[PDB]
Design a protein around this ligand. Structure first.
Ligand code: NA
Ligand code: NA
Ligand SMILES: [Zn+2]
Ligand SMILES: [Zn+2]
Length: 327
DNA sequence: CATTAGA
DNA sequence: TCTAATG
């Protein structure tokens, strides 16, 4: 956790770079299990030889380890860190819409800088355009203070349209987070469940709504169950116009909201932990459901869930307020 | 791990 | 169709 800190750190830098700059999946894939194994290893690694004892730790990796060990550095790192083509790839990637594929690609043409990205808007697709467009606003953390106003709003129109519209702003803000990266609206309605062959318009109405009011400024993407957008608070009595907020709204079968709500909220650890437990209690927990286990190794039979509660009850646990869904 | 663009 | 990108 801190005993094998650097070791894992460099391993990750190292892993990462393979996978981005070079399209070296495997080397990258190497750097990770190692980076993974060595993480756990309950003893302060003092030589590569020691590491080497490890599963996933080859000769190349340890080579590095010792090097890191001796000199509080690594050449491959100093070289990478330094190197432009690489620096540029990691950079550009920051644009919403820009993964490493396109990243390398642009570089190849020489769109290393941001301005580059500008003169080359033709070269960019829709998302990527909006990426570039709210480049700053996107890097920006969302103050709860605003999460509340937004949420506020979202709730009304959700309502103004149909009263059957059940909606939850999940995520960190759900667990009292003082800020968030983007607001996530978990949405379902009674007419939509496991069975009833969809009803695309259910998601659609609402997109149109928030939009009709100006909350939704743009379309990052929009499917029949998932919509990814840009939103923004009515820049008031002016002199202070709101930053464009990243937003996501997802339509759900009502019959499987909660496991999904549970899910969406996290944290990852409460999850994995809540997830670890269900199993003991003789169950199976998923991004949408909870099934009973059957000694035959496994089982099925998706249980009836009427609240974040029921699920707990199931695995018979203490209801943990979202606020304390911390770990 | 699943959903959406897009080519 | 696959292949990228988000989450
Ligand atoms: Na080994
Ligand atoms: Na990106
Ligand atoms: Zn020890
Ligand atoms: Zn989100």
């Amino acid at each position: 956790e801190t005993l094998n800190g650097g070791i894992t750190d460099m391993l990750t830098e190292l892993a990462n770079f393979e996978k981005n700059v070079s399209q070296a999946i495997h080397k990258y894939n190497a750097y990770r299990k190692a980076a993974s194994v060595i993480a756990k290893y309950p003893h302060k690694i003092k030589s590569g030889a020691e590491a080497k004892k490890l599963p996933g730790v080859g000769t190349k990796i340890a080579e590095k380890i010792d090097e890191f060990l001796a000199t509080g550095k690594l050449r491959k790192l100093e070289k990478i860190r330094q190197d432009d083509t690489s620096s540029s790839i990691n950079f550009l990637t920051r644009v919403s819409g820009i993964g490493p594929s396109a990243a390398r690609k642009f570089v190849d043409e020489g769109i290393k800088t941001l301005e580059d990205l500008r003169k080359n808007e033709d070269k960019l697709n829709h998302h990527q355009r909006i990426g570039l467009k709210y480049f700053g606003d996107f890097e920006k953390r969302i103050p709860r203070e605003e999460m509340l106003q937004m949420q506020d709003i979202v709730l009304n129109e959700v309502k103004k349209v149909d009263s059957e519209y059940i909606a939850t702003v999940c995520g960190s803000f759900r667990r009292g987070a003082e800020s968030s990266g983007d607001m996530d609206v978990l949405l379902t309605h009674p007419s939509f469940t496991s069975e009833s062959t969809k009803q695309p318009k259910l998601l659609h109405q609402v997109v149109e709504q928030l939009q009709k009011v100006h909350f939704i400024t743009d379309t990052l993407s929009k499917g029949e169950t998932k919509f990814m957008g840009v939103c923004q608070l009515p820049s008031k009595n002016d002199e202070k116009e709101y930053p464009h907020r990243r937003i996501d709204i997802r339509l759900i079968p009502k019959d499987q909201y909660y496991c999904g709500v549970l899910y969406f909220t996290g944290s990852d650890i409460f999850n994995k932990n809540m997830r670890a437990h269900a199993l003991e209690k003789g169950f199976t927990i998923n991004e949408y459901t909870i099934r009973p286990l059957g000694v035959t190794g496994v089982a099925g039979e998706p249980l009836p869930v009427d609240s974040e509660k029921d699920i707990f009850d199931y695995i018979q646990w203490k209801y943990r307020e979202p606020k304390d869904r911390s770990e």
